[PDB]
């Protein structure tokens, strides 16, 4: 295992002997065993550049496009070139064509254009040997994969007449019979093969066709699951000790394993819930199965689409999205990746992006119309958009497909057939009932519900049909029909949790009874104690405003599934709402010590920050960054956000240089994120560019605090080079173009910001100040007047306009804008910003007492009161607004100025302006300096 | 709900019922009509109260013993806004609400409907 020393000695071989092919073929086969498809491609290509007829390197390039890239065009063209080398080298070797066709068919992922090329290679083998049953069996198999079950039947029947002993042909014929619903023939022929099996040894295929027959006969799910467990555990027993050679792909049979996974997924959940639910061991088996197919042939992209789907169904939507992005960068035209991406966006309520990914899925493959799950997801998207009538059409298009109903001979459905998942079949019925219900077609909803009761009878999913009858009963106002159905679900039945939640919800909605709600929820806790039911019980108690029992529920969950960060965060929230901060802190520390998800650093930091323990947050985030930085794309972005967050904390620590170093370390990590995201996750590019913009904006802010306004312009220009149209970045570079005396570039950023959003008040006021500096006072006024005619209640724009009108000498224009605020908002007179704007006006008209009265009504407000206080201090220092110590007038007024009455009342106003200054709490060093100056003016 | 849970949070805070105040703040932040800004402002005030005192009741109201509804409800007196614990008591011939037999003596007209007392 000294791969670095081996690579050095191999480079010495290739330096001494550049032409020596055997080294490269060994290096290529070793690199496939090392899962290194990149260097396996380099060695295959470097070998093909020296031996263009090399069948193994051509086979390895055709396998690369089938087994990492999923690229149908590159796979079909490398299969064409491989076939043309067979025409060049032993064209009569029908066995070599057959061997090639087995490898490529068992790995194809049901691609029609790959299967057409494979079929022509196998048809050439069959024209060379028409007597060969097995060539006809694999034509039978390739016709199942193309959906051509009529041609599959002919190719298996001809394989049987070519060899009556070809059990391979009979297994394939039984698979066609089961797809056709010819169950009685499949049953008898499987019993016949189960007697013959002792002469063959146990085959996972025969157990699988028993599991499929048992599923079609509606046998108990634990029996079908136990048969599939025996299919997997017998199948893997064949593969023991084998090297990762091309023969492993034929023996592993990826195609067969993905069907098995899809019917484990018929028994799995249909929702992206977090771990800790009694179904989850079925998803755990699915992960293990798909991980063997990812060890070997992940470019059968249906594998990594199914890992993304299993990740989604276990609540890891970020891992699902990353695996889908990865699939779409192996092949952008891969329709199933867009189909699950629609389910990702649907779960996020991103209904527009769900519709766009459905339209992309269809644009790349019109044969997506042949799958009921497509029509279900488009109906879900249409229903959420309110396109109810078109959701009726797509659910009827779903029901038109074969296998969506129990049907005999002379079928109305005549398209290519598929093995419909019972949970999809259920969902398409249940959502047609809901879409008719939403359309007011209560009779059609009830008719299709009776059809669903008939369709799913005797299954565990029949209880979901009874809960759907209770849902339709609630829409019909039959609340007691709903309750009696739900009450008829008891401790020994599946779906009792949802039944008792619905009973609880009904009693809280209709009977207004929290105790019937709580007793239904305590029945969930008593009968069906598990981490998800205890999490849901917690959330129920939070809706009931009883967080202590919610915390008991979150404890009853979290002591059973300590891996769930979502539960640990919900636990944290309830503990914060109940002053249990040490438990929240220590649960977040345990989740971070067990390596859980990105946001847990933010949960713990923002908690400690809101508790004012900024130093504890600093040390926590430093400890969360004490590892050697992990090179995974997730971990790079996580550490980048941890560094950004540590810089946000360092801001409150006054550690602004460390904040810059942490932000530059985040910029370094974020560059490594972008240079992979552009190649494997391109849909994340705007968000990751925006995070790079925000990093550069914070570097610029810290450089402003360091008085390096040139670095501030530089790093806000970098923030624009990342994101040219972020409102805060535009406004902040406008502020710096202003602060460094470029009013023209400031006006460019104002004009662009106003073009991007006309209602941006700061851009209008900054532009009006620049018009005022350019002596375009009429424009400065008119743009603030337009902004007040859009937003009459706007004390910033009003107080800016008042000072413009003071500096112009046009105070008479102001009362209009007070009246506009009063007309919009009769309470505007009560607001500290109105009281501040009014206090300013009276100081300019000449009424210092009325100015003081209106400033006083504002004076405690955090903006308007702070600014009012400074103007109260101006009046209390100097109520006559004189030159203090001016000899032209302080030698006059003596008939009042020599009196104790004027002296003592003025000096009381001075000595109490110090108390107004004690009410001016500063928040900056400039605030402390201006405060100290005005205390010294007193 | 904004007016209700604001006034309840205020009276609960002034009462030092900071857990009942926490109930009212959770109810406020849940409201889908609020902006993230308003949700944060209510959270800032809740956390200010919680850090300066606690997020739990230092003194406890007990009226939730009726408001869970399972045991039923005593009639709330229109003179006082508290449940009537009397076995039999005055009721308004117009609106048919109850009043405590001591508290009704304070009035000429029904506190709810302003009809003359009888």
From Swiss-Prot, chain A:
Changing residue 748 to Q: Hypomorphic variant in vitro. Changing residue 375 to R: In NPHP12; uncertain significance; functionally null mutation in vitro. Changing residue 400 to N: In JBTS11; hypomorphic variant in vitro. It comes from Homo sapiens. It is linked to Ciliary dysfunction leads to a broad spectrum of disorders, collectively termed ciliopathies. Overlapping clinical features include retinal degeneration, renal cystic disease, skeletal abnormalities, fibrosis of various organ, and a complex range of anatomical and functional defects of the central and peripheral nervous system. The ciliopathy range of diseases includes Meckel-Gruber syndrome, Bardet-Biedl syndrome, Joubert syndrome, nephronophtisis, Senior-Loken syndrome, and Jeune asphyxiating thoracic dystrophy among others. TTC21B is causally associated with diverse ciliopathies. GO terms for biological process: Bergmann glial cell differentiation; cerebellar Purkinje cell differentiation; cilium assembly; forebrain dorsal/ventral pattern formation; intraciliary retrograde transport; negative regulation of eating behavior; positive regulation of canonical Wnt signaling pathway; positive regulation of gene expression. The chain holds residues 192 to 1129 of 1316 of the full protein. It comes from the Eukaryota. TPR repeats lie at residues 1-20, 94-132, 133-166, 301-334, 372-405, 426-459, 531-564, 566-598, 600-631, 640-673, 693-726, 728-760, 761-794, 832-865. Component of the IFT complex A (IFT-A), a complex required for retrograde ciliary transport and entry into cilia of G protein-coupled receptors (GPCRs). Essential for retrograde trafficking of IFT-1, IFT-B and GPCRs. Negatively modulates the SHH signal transduction. It is found in: Cytoplasm, Cytoskeleton, Cilium axoneme. GO terms for cellular component: ciliary tip; cilium; cytoplasm; cytoskeleton; intraciliary transport particle A. One of its GO terms (molecular function) is chromatin binding. Changing residue 18 to L: In NPHP12; also found in a patient with Bardet-Biedl syndrome carrying two variants in BBS4; hypomorphic variant in vitro. Keywords: Cell projection, Ciliopathy, Cilium, Cytoplasm, Cytoskeleton, Disease variant, Intellectual disability, Joubert syndrome, Meckel syndrome, Nephronophthisis, Obesity, Repeat, TPR repeat. The keyword Cytoplasm applies. Component of the IFT complex A (IFT-A) complex. IFT-A complex is divided into a core subcomplex composed of IFT122:IFT140:WDR19 which is associated with TULP3 and a peripheral subcomplex composed of IFT43:WDR35:TTC21B. Interacts directy with WDR35 and TTC21B. Interacts with TTC25. This is Tetratricopeptide repeat protein 21B. Belongs to the TTC21 family. Its main location: cytoplasm.
Curated annotation (Swiss-Prot), chain B:
It is found in: Cytoplasm, Cytoskeleton, Microtubule organizing center, Centrosome; Cytoplasm, Cytoskeleton, Cilium axoneme; Cytoplasm, Cytoskeleton, Cilium basal body. Induction: By TNF. Transmembrane segments: none annotated. As a component of the IFT complex A (IFT-A), a complex required for retrograde ciliary transport and entry into cilia of G protein-coupled receptors (GPCRs), it is involved in ciliogenesis and ciliary protein trafficking. May promote CASP3 activation and TNF-stimulated apoptosis. It is linked to Cranioectodermal dysplasia 2: A disorder characterized by craniofacial, skeletal and ectodermal abnormalities. Clinical features include short stature, dolichocephaly, craniosynostosis, narrow thorax with pectus excavatum, short limbs, brachydactyly, joint laxity, narrow palpebral fissures, telecanthus with hypertelorism, low-set simple ears, everted lower lip, and short neck. Teeth abnormalities include widely spaced, hypoplastic and fused teeth. Short-rib thoracic dysplasia 7 with or without polydactyly: A form of short-rib thoracic dysplasia, a group of autosomal recessive ciliopathies that are characterized by a constricted thoracic cage, short ribs, shortened tubular bones, and a 'trident' appearance of the acetabular roof. Polydactyly is variably present. Non-skeletal involvement can include cleft lip/palate as well as anomalies of major organs such as the brain, eye, heart, kidneys, liver, pancreas, intestines, and genitalia. Component of the IFT complex A (IFT-A) complex. IFT-A complex is divided into a core subcomplex composed of IFT122:IFT140:WDR19 which is associated with TULP3 and a peripheral subcomplex composed of IFT43:WDR35:TTC21B. Interacts directy with IFT122, ITF43 and TTC21B. Interacts with IFT43. Interacts with CFAP61. This is WD repeat-containing protein 35. It comes from Homo sapiens. The chain holds residues 1064 to 1181 of 1181 of the full protein.
């Amino acid at each position: 295992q000294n791969y670095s020393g081996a690579l050095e000695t191999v480079n010495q071989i290739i330096v001494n002997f550049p032409s020596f092919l055997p080294a490269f073929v060994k290096k290529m086969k070793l690199q496939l065993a090392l899962q290194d498809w990149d260097q396996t491609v380099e060695t295959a290509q470097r070998l093909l550049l020296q031996d263009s007829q090399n069948v193994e390197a051509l086979r390895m390039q055709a396998l690369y496009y089938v087994c990492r890239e999923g690229d149908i065009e590159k796979a079909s063209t490398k299969l064409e070139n491989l076939g043309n080398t067979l025409d060049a080298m032993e064209p009569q070797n029908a066995q070599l064509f057959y061997n090639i066709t087995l490898a490529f068919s068992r790995t194809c992922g049901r691609s029609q254009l790959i299967l057409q090329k494979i079929q022509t290679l196998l048809e050439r083998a069959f024209s060379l040997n028409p007597q060969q049953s097995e060539f006809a069996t694999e034509l039978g198999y390739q016709m199942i994969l193309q959906g051509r079950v009529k041609e599959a039947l002919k190719w298996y029947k001809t394989a049987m007449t070519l060899d009556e002993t070809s059990v391979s042909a009979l297994v394939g014929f039984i698979q066609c019979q089961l797809i056709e619903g010819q169950l009685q023939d499949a049953d008898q022929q499987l019993e016949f093969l189960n007697e013959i099996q002792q002469s063959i040894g146990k085959s996972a295929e025969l157990i699988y066709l028993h599991a499929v027959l048992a599923m079609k006969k509606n046998k108990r799910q634990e029996e079908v699951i136990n048969l599939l467990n025996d299919v997997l555990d017998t199948h893997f027993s064949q593969l023991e000790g084998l090297p990762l050679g091309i023969q492993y792909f034929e023996k592993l049979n990826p195609d067969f394993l993905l069907e098995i996974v899809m019917e484990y997924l018929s028994f799995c959940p249909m929702q992206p819930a977090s771990p800790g639910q009694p179904l989850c061991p079925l998803l755990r088996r699915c992960i293990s199965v798909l991980e063997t197919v990812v060890r070997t042939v992940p470019g059968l992209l249906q594998t990594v689409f199914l890992i993304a789907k299993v990740k989604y169904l276990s609540g890891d939507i970020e891992a699902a999205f990353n695996n889908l992005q990865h699939c779409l960068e192996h092949n952008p035209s891969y329709a199933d990746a867009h189909l699950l991406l629609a389910q990702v966006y649907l779960s996020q309520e991103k209904v527009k992006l769900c519709s766009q990914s459905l339209e992309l899925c269809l644009s790349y493959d019109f044969k997506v119309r042949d799958y009921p799950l497509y029509h279900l997801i488009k109906a879900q998207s249409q229903k959420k958009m309110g396109e109810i009538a078109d959701a009726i059409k797509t659910l009827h298009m779903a029901m038109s497909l074969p296998g969506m109903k129990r049907i005999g001979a002379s079928t109305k459905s005549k398209d290519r057939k598929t093995e419909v998942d019972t949970s999809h079949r259920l969902s398409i019925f249940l959502e047609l009932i809901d879409v008719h219900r939403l359309n007011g077609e209560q009779h059609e909803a009830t008719k299709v519900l009776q059809d669903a009761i008939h369709e799913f009878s005797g299954t565990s999913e029949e209880v979901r049909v009874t809960i759907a009858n209770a849902d339709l009963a609630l829409a019909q106002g039959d609340i007691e029909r709903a309750l009696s159905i739900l009450q008829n679900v008891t401790a020994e039945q599946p779906y009792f949790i949802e039944a008792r939640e619905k009973m609880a919800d009904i009693y809280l909605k209709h009977r207004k009874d929290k105790m019937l709600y709580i007793t239904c929820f305590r029945e969930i806790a008593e009968r069906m104690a598990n981490p998800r039911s205890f999490l849901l019980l917690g959330d129920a108690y939070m809706n009931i405003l009883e967080p202590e029992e919610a915390i008991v529920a979150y404890e009853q969950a979290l002591n059973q599934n300590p891996k769930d960060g979502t539960l640990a965060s919900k636990m944290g929230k309830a503990l914060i709402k109940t002053h249990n901060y040490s438990m929240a802190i220590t649960y977040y520390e345990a989740a971070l010590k067990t390596g859980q998800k990105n946001y847990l650093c933010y949960d713990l930091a923002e908690l400690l920050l809101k508790l004012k323990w900024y130093d504890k947050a600093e040390k926590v985030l430093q400890h969360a960054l004490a590892h050697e930085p992990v090179n995974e794309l997730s971990a790079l972005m996580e550490d980048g956000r941890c560094q950004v967050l540590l810089a946000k904390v360092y801001s409150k620590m006054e550690k602004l240089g460390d904040a810059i170093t942490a932000l530059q370390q985040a910029r370094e990590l974020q560059a490594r994120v972008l240079k992979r995201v552009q190649m494997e996750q391109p849909d994340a590019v705007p968000a990751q560019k925006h995070l790079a913009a925000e990093i550069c904006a914070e570097i610029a802010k810290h450089s402003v605090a360091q008085r390096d306004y040139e670095k501030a312009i530089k790093f806000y220009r970098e923030a624009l080079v990342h994101c040219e149209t972020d409102n805060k970045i535009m406004l902040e570079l406008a502020r710096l173009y202003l602060a460094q005396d470029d009013p023209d570039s400031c006006l460019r950023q104002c004009a662009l910001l106003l073009q991007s959003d006309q209602d941006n008040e700061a851009a209008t006021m900054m532009m009006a100040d620049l018009m005022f500096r350019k002596q375009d006072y009429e424009q400065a006024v008119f743009h603030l007047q337009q902004l007040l005619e859009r937003k009459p209640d706007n004390y910033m724009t009003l107080s800016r306009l008042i000072d413009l009108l003071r500096r112009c000498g046009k105070l008479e224009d102001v009362p209009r804008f007070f009246s506009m605020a009063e007309k919009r908002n009769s309470r505007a007179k009560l607001e500290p910003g109105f009281q501040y704007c009014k206090g300013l006006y009276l100081w300019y008209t000449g009424e210092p007492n009325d100015a003081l009265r209106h400033f006083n009504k504002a004076r405690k407000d955090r903006d308007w009161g702070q600014n009012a206080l400074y103007n109260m201090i101006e009046i209390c220092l100097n109520p006559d607004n004189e030159t203090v110590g001016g000899e032209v007038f302080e030698n006059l007024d003596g008939d009042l100025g020599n009196s104790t009455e004027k002296q003592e009342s003025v000096q009381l106003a001075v000595r109490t302006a110090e108390k107004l200054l004690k009410e001016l709490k500063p928040q900056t060093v400039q605030g402390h300096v201006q405060l100290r100056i005005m205390e010294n003016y007193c | 709900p904004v007016e209700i849970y604001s006034l309840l949070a205020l009276c609960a805070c002034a009462s030092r019922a900071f857990g009942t105040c926490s109930k009212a703040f959770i109810k406020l932040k849940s409201l889908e009509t609020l902006s993230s800004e308003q949700k944060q402002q209510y959270e800032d005030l809740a956390l200010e109260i919680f850090t300066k005192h606690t997020s739990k009741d230092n003194r406890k109201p007990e009226l939730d013993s009726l408001m869970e509804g399972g045991e039923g409800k005593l009639p709330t007196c229109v003179a006082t806004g508290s449940p009537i614990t009397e076995y039999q008591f005055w009721m308004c011939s117009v609106c048919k609400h109850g009043v405590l037999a001591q508290e009704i003596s304070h009035y000429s007209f029904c506190p709810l409907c302003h009809s003359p007392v009888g």
